[PDB]
């Protein structure tokens, strides 16, 4: 004679990640830091670029 | 919900999607597409 | 007999080029074109740079 069975199963999570890089050059960093400002009509275009 | 252009096929008695994402994703990048895996014999 | 005159626009080959009129072509020493093409990026993890 048989009896009915109950099953208990437990799973767990698995952790991963994603990575992406983003670089700015030294000249653009010097333009964005508002250091050595001079000739405001010709450096504004470089800053906008 | 939003309306999206995507094809739907019927297999057996189930309505499934059929995506072949190779132009939307993995195009003009530096990564290799999966589902092109290798076998060893 | 009379000839059947061909115009280039009515031909099917006119779809393969962009014709444009330029009168001062004899003075042009060098003419250039420019392209700025960017590419997408996928994001991953693990033992990858």
Swiss-Prot record, chain A:
Subcellular location: Virion; Host nucleus
Protein family membership: Belongs to the herpesviridae major capsid protein family.
Function: Self-assembles to form an icosahedral capsid with a T=16 symmetry, about 200 nm in diameter, and consisting of 150 hexons and 12 pentons (total of 162 capsomers). Hexons form the edges and faces of the capsid and are each composed of six MCP molecules. In contrast, one penton is found at each of the 12 vertices. Eleven of the pentons are MCP pentamers, while the last vertex is occupied by the portal complex.
Quaternary structure annotation from Swiss-Prot or TrEMBL: Homomultimer. Makes the hexons and eleven out of twelve pentons. Interacts with triplex proteins 1/TRX1 and 2/TRX2; adjacent capsomers are linked together in groups of three by triplexes, heterotrimeric complexes composed of one molecule of TRX1 and two molecules of TRX2. Interacts with scaffold protein; this interaction allows efficient MCP transport to the host nucleus. Interacts with capsid vertex component 2/CVC2. Interacts with the small capsomere-interacting protein/SCP.
Name the record gives this protein: Major capsid protein
Organism: Varicella-zoster virus (strain Dumas)
Residues of the full protein shown: 124 to 172 of 1396
